[PDB]
């Protein structure tokens, strides 16, 4: 497999953490996410669940965090929304500020990752 992936997944110590882990695995394995990480040559050492401000990118892709939960028991955010937050965080591998260049790349990555054939 490709080196352009998330090398380690981490979830928090909340009820149904096995479900949070499956959520991160789904994002890592998402064909659209893989396409853009391959196209843009991104390796992210760590992808974590953010404590339940919907995502973070630390040090240009050393570590990305995503808020998966809507509460502290079994409420989770919808996949489409979290996937798009992940694309936002990946865009911060290149652009620090939410400027025109950021949003241009965000739109291009979004289109790639949403392609109908994947
Ligand atoms: Ni941002």
Residue numbers in the entry: 1 to 52, 62 to 127
Please quote the paper that reports this structure.
Covalent DNA-protein crosslinks (DPCs) are toxic DNA lesions that interfere with essential chromatin transactions, such as replication and transcription. In yeast, DPC proteolysis is catalyzed by the metalloprotease Wss1, which permits replication in the presence of DPCs and provides resistance toward DPC-inducing agents. Spartan (SPRTN, DVC1) is distantly related to yeast Wss1, displays a similar domain organization, and shares a common evolutionary origin (Stingele et al., 2015).
To gain insights into how this feat is achieved, we sought to obtain structural information on this protease family. An X-ray fluorescence spectrum of crystals obtained at the synchrotron revealed the presence of nickel as the only heavy-metal atom. An anomalous dataset at the Ni2+ edge (z = 1.4854) confirmed that this ion occupies the active site of the enzyme, where it replaced the catalytic zinc presumably during the Ni2+-affinity chromatography. The overall architecture depicted a compact protease domain consisting of four tightly packed α helices and a four-stranded antiparallel β sheet. Intriguingly, the catalytic center comprising the metal-binding motif was highly solvent exposed. This together with the absence of an obvious substrate-binding cleft or region could explain the promiscuity of SPRTN/Wss1 proteases with respect to substrate identity. Our structural data further highlighted the need to restrain the protease activity of the SPRTN/Wss1 family since the catalytic center is solvent exposed and bears few signs of specificity-generating features.
